[PDB]
Design an enzyme around this catalytic site. Structure first.
Site, PDB file in Angstrom:
ATOM      1  N   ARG A 207       0.844  -1.186   0.000  1.00 49.19           N
ATOM      2  CA  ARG A 207       0.000   0.000   0.000  1.00 49.19           C
ATOM      3  C   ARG A 207       0.890   1.252   0.000  1.00 49.19           C
ATOM      4  NH1 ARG A 207      -4.834   1.365   3.699  1.00 49.19           N
ATOM      5  NH2 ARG A 207      -4.469   3.091   2.174  1.00 49.19           N
ATOM      6  N   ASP A 232      -3.415  -1.039   8.232  1.00 50.83           N
ATOM      7  CA  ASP A 232      -2.531   0.083   8.660  1.00 50.83           C
ATOM      8  C   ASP A 232      -1.862  -0.316   9.974  1.00 50.83           C
ATOM      9  OD1 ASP A 232      -3.433   1.765   6.521  1.00 50.83           O
ATOM     10  OD2 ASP A 232      -4.732   2.893   7.845  1.00 50.83           O
ATOM     11  N   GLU A 500      -3.889  14.352   5.641  1.00 45.41           N
ATOM     12  CA  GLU A 500      -2.856  13.950   4.677  1.00 45.41           C
ATOM     13  C   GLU A 500      -2.851  15.014   3.584  1.00 45.41           C
ATOM     14  OE1 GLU A 500      -4.905  10.319   3.954  1.00 45.41           O
ATOM     15  OE2 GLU A 500      -3.347   9.121   4.952  1.00 45.41           O
ATOM     16  N   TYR A 611      -5.296   5.376  -2.386  1.00 47.08           N
ATOM     17  CA  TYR A 611      -4.143   6.271  -2.296  1.00 47.08           C
ATOM     18  C   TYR A 611      -3.422   6.259  -3.682  1.00 47.08           C
ATOM     19  CZ  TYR A 611      -4.266   6.847   2.858  1.00 47.08           C
ATOM     20  OH  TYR A 611      -4.639   7.164   4.135  1.00 47.08           O
TER      21      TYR A 611
END
Length: 656
Positions: A207, A232, A500, A611
């Site tokens: 990722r 995560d 982010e 992402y």
């Protein structure tokens, strides 16, 4: 050898009868079917082929392989009389379109009666294998009388009609072995992966891709190699890198650039079913969420978050930086095994001091966080992971250096998050030892979390800017001394945004930070003094996302577009999930507003897109690497070979 092979069958929902050619060819009942196809429309559920009992009342007696409008590949095997209904599938298995053209994919299904499994392949990956109790092959289904291309004949009517071309389809009357079908399904799509499951990294999962083009024309990538599925946290994650010296056409074999060895870099088969997918590697030190920047002197910096073993980003204390201030200097604290308090610090040359006596000990910590006693390394046993749908983490007999970030260390850091960075003087081929960032948020706050992507060098001042966030604030990390020392600008946000961010420069001294929010919109804050002060947020009017949001990528572009300085933005754009990836071109006006004039849909709107990272290639094309799946969905965890690299000319990006 195929029992039937057909080719260039173009269909618009109406199917083609092949009963004559296949009836009585499947004597055992096992089968393999390999289909190379492209879709002319993605809408609806579409069967590539169908083997059925077509009679009235037998609608639930069939086998098929199907595609959905979101890129999911699946199969059914059903029997009406015995009321058995198998469905095996994996999200995010195929591609739809790419630069206005239908993408050619190759998929396959294997039905093996001995081991009672269905397996599905797409573009060189076995996307799923499932053993089922109620197994069915073609002979198990009562009264099979119809074999069809591009649909399933149910009660005398074509269902699931396929829209596209079956480029080539092969029927085999046996279960072909894994490596043969992988190879048959390998195609041009397979080649768009820089990182692949169980490559040199030893990871099955990736990722958080990052792309960056260096001033010498090298195109560099970094990624999270996530070993224990895609979680995560908790997980065991390393940062891997790979680069291209030929405009992205060929890429080096990946290296592990930031890695801990409390666990080895080995492939783990992470369970995807509801009962196992929540399982985590719990005892492993981690690097996560990388940021790259090139300094003006051509030195490259890479930053990453660091998490000690067993330390959850959720649970971890937010009121201790992990540092102590002694006579004006900041030193990393340690707690020794058996102590409740942190009585020790790492001071000059890695020497560990007992803070109570203010004296150096016999212990020291090397540049890679390893612990020594009188010059000799202390060791601990490395952990392996085993599955038997129960998971065990166990000591495997290999000795590695005891490390301050490990579960089994004699001296441990504060259980909180940190940021580390490394430098390279040879455009990413080799790297320094990590430096932990000092307690720039204060002694009594945790480090910020990095916003993955790139940093920038603001041109008027030369200030290095690195995006990060706290959960309530933006934290723009910066250096005004070419990276010798670091400071932060902390900017309270309107709400608890997981902010982010990425930066663009509009004109000298004038920068913008585009970021994720908790309100569905992409925010941008503007600074007219090179990041020292920031305006109130403004919001893009044309992106509408779920409240949780997603990371974005935005870059400056070096060539004029329609006579104007440009920026380029990549994001999902859908309220239904992490889907509907778009690239947007923004043209900077003289007043520093942006005319967001062009957008391009990367694939069809239901296809996953999470992402992402953009870079300008040396030829002035655009490189994109992205998570081609929905990384928020609990249904799309732990998938292999789902982070591709693709490219675009500006002329391609003007279309949509």
């Amino acid at each position: 050898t195929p029992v039937l092979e057909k080719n260039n069958v173009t269909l618009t929902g109406g199917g083609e009868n092949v009963t004559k050619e296949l009836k009585d060819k499947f004597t055992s009942g096992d089968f393999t079917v390999v289909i190379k196809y492209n879709q002319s429309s993605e809408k609806g559920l579409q069967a590539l082929f169908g083997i059925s009992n077509s009679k009235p009342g037998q609608q639930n007696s069939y086998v098929d392989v199907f595609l959905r409008d979101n890129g999911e590949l699946g199969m059914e095997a059903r029997d009406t009389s015995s009321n058995k209904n198998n469905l095996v599938s994996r999200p995010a298995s195929v591609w739809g379109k790419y630069k206005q053209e239908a993408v050619t994919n190759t998929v396959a299904v294997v039905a093996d009666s001995v081991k009672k499994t269905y397996s599905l392949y797409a573009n060189g990956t076995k996307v799923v294998e499932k053993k089922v109790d109620n197994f069915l092959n073609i002979k198990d289904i009562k009264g099979i009388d119809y074999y069809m291309l591009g649909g399933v004949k149910r009660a005398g009517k074509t269902a699931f009609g396929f829209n596209g071309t079956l480029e080539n389809i092969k029927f085999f009357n046996s279960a072909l072995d894994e490596e043969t079908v992988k190879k048959m399904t390998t195609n041009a799509v397979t080649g768009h992966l820089i990182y692949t499951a169980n490559d040199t990294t030893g990871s099955n999962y990736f990722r958080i891709p990052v792309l960056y083009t260096f001033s010498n024309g090298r195109v560099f990538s970094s990624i999270d190699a996530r070993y224990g599925g895609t979680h995560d946290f908790l997980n065991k994650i390393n940062i891997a890198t790979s680069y291209s010296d030929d405009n992205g056409k060929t890429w080096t074999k990946p290296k592990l650039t930031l890695a801990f060895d409390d666990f080895a870099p080995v492939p783990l088969e992470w369970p995807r079913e509801v009962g196992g997918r929540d399982l985590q590697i719990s005892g492993g030190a981690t690097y996560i969420d990388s940021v790259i920047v090139e300094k003006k002197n051509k030195q490259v910096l890479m930053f990453a978050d660091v998490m000690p073993a067993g330390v959850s980003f959720r649970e971890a204390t937010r009121k201790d930086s992990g540092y102590k201030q002694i006579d004006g200097n900041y030193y990393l604290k340690l707690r020794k095994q058996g102590d409740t308090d942190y009585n020790y610090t790492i001071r000059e040359n890695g020497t560990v001091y007992d803070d109570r006596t203010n004296r150096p000990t016999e212990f020291s910590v090397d540049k890679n966080f390893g612990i020594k006693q009188n010059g000799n390394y202390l060791t601990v046993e490395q952990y392996s992971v085993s599955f038997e749908n129960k998971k065990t983490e166990y000591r495997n007999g290999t000795k590695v250096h005891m490390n301050i970030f490990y579960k089994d260390a004699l001296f441990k850091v504060v259980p909180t998050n940190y940021i580390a960075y490394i430098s390279s003087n040879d455009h990413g081929e080799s790297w320094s030892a990590p430096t932990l960032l000092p307690p720039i948020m204060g002694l009594n706050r945790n480090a910020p979390y990095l916003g993955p992507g790139r940093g920038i060098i603001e041109s008027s001042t030369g200030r290095i800017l690195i995006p990060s966030y706290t959960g309530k604030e933006s934290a723009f990390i910066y250096s005004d001394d070419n990276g010798a020392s670091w400071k932060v600008k902390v900017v309270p946000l309107p709400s608890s945004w997981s902010a982010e961010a990425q930066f663009v420069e509009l004109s000298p001294g004038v920068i913008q930070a585009y970021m994720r929010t908790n309100n569905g919109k992409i925010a941008y804050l503007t600074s007219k003094d090179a990041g020292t002060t920031w305006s109130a947020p403004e919001y893009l009017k044309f992106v509408s996302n779920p409240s949780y949001g997603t990371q974005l990528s935005i870059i400056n572009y070096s060539q004029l577009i329609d006579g104007k300085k440009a920026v380029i933005l990549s994001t999902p754009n859908s309220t239904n999930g992490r889907k509907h990836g778009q690239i947007w071109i923004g043209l900077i006006n003289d007043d520093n507003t942006i005319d967001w004039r062009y957008h391009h849909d990367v694939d069809y709107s239901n296809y996953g897109y999470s992402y992402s990272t953009l870079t300008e290639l040396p030829n002035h094309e655009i490189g994109l690497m992205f998570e081609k799946f929905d990384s928020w969905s609990r249904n799309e965890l732990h998938m292999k070979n789902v982070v591709p690299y693709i490219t675009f000319k500006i002329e391609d990006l003007k279309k949509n």
